[PDB]
From a paper:
Heat shock protein 90 ([name]) is the most abundant ATP-dependent molecular chaperone that plays a key role in the folding, stabilization, and function of a wide variety of client proteins within the cell. [name] is a functional homodimer composed of two identical subunits, each one consisting of three domains: the N-terminal ([name]), for ATP- and drug-binding and a co-chaperone interacting motif, the middle (MD), for client and co-chaperone binding, and the C-terminal (CTD) domain, for constitutive dimerization as well as co-chaperone and client interaction. Indeed, this domain is structured as a two-layer sandwich, formed by a β-sheet on one side and a cluster of α-helices on the other, delimiting the ATP-binding pocket, a flat-bottomed cone of about 15 Å in depth. In fact, molecules targeting the active site behave as [name] inhibitors by competing with ATP and preventing its hydrolysis.
The only exception is represented by one residue, namely Lys112 in hHsp90-[name], which is replaced by a different amino acid in the protozoan counterpart (e.g., Arg97 in Leishmania braziliensis [name]-[name]). Therefore, we decided to replace Lys112 with both an arginine ([name]), representing the parasite protein, and an alanine ([name]). To obtain additional insight in this field, we characterized the complex of [name] with the [name] variant, the “leishmanized” protein, and the [name] variant, specifically selected to remove the contribution of Lys112 to the ligand binding. The ligand occupies the active pocket in both chains of all structures, and it shows a conserved binding mode stabilized by a tight network of interactions. In all complexes, the residue in position 112, being lysine in hHsp90-[name], arginine in [name], and alanine in [name], points outside the catalytic cavity, thus is not involved in ligand binding within the active site. In agreement with our findings, the contribution of Lys112 to the ligand binding is therefore not crucial and both the human lysine and the parasite arginine are not involved in the interaction with [name]. The binding mode of the ligand is not altered upon the removal of the contribution provided by these residues, as verified by the replacement with alanine in the [name] variant. The peculiar network of interactions is conserved in each hHsp90-[name] variant and observed both in the substrate and in other ligands and/or inhibitors.
Numbering used by the authors: 15 to 226
């Protein structure tokens, strides 16, 4: 064992349905949101590194990398943001998902734009437009490396990660649905980034696969 299982609060099934009923026609939006979250965590590490530059001992470069993988049908997004404790992980993907689902629904119900999804703390869930399963590996300076995983049903799991150590930051791996392998194409990824994340204040690098 050492795997812990968590039940989503009921708002999550509502979230998933809202997301389909708001972004199904524009699925590419998930990349904007993930990049955006990466940007946020980058902002936090930059910020605390000003008061204490030892915060950057775990890695100085502040960036975002995008790693398609046609062979695995995965798209992974890596950042060296501040990363998450176990409690941040559970808090952001669980507690705040559910309270932010409610706030977002109330905001749309009063005519706010859907493009607001990010600001209600549930942008990440848009990932399930394109992915049957998502894994979030994260590592923050005051804590171990954790893996979070969910197919967005009723539960999510947390375990201590024993995989390749990142030094600090967050990795989201998307296991793409059969019908969404367009998100593994170099051309497509470049477009989406160009369109949605042009003004992100941190280098976003696409890692190309070779022919072999
Ligand atoms: C305790 C401090 N740690 C972090 O905050 C952190 N560290 N890594 N990430 C992070 C999280 C995700 C998602 C899986 C939630 C991500 O895709 C990339 C990340 O760097 C985060 C992270 C956590 C939450 C968010 C969401 N912020 C939304 C918020 C809404 C209101 C306006 C300001 C921004 C974005 C990034």
């Amino acid at each position: 064992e050492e795997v812990e299982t968590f039940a989503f609060q009921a708002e999550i099934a509502q979230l998933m349905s809202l997301i389909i009923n708001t972004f199904y026609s524009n699925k590419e939006i998930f990349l904007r949101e993930l990049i955006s979250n990466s940007s946020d965590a980058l902002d936090k590490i930059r910020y605390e590194s000003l008061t204490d530059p030892s915060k950057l001992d775990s890695g100085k470069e502040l960036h975002i990398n995008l790693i398609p993988n046609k062979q695995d049908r995965t798209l992974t997004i890596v950042d060296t943001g501040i990363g998450m404790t176990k409690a941040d992980l559970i808090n952001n993907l669980g507690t705040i998902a559910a309270s932010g689902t409610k706030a977002f629904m109330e905001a749309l119900q009063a005519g706010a734009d859907i493009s607001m999804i990010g600001q209600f703390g549930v942008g990440f869930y848009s990932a399930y437009l394109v992915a049957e399963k998502v894994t979030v590996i994260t590592k923050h300076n005051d804590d171990e490396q954790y893996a979070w995983e969910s197919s967005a049903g009723g539960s999510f799991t947390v375990r201590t990660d024993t995989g390749e150590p990142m030094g600090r930051g967050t990795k989201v791996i998307l296991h793409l649905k059969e019908d969404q392998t367009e998100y593994l194409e170099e051309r497509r990824i470049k477009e989406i980034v160009k369109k949605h994340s042009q003004f992100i204040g941190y280098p976003i690098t696409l890692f190309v696969e070779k022919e072999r």
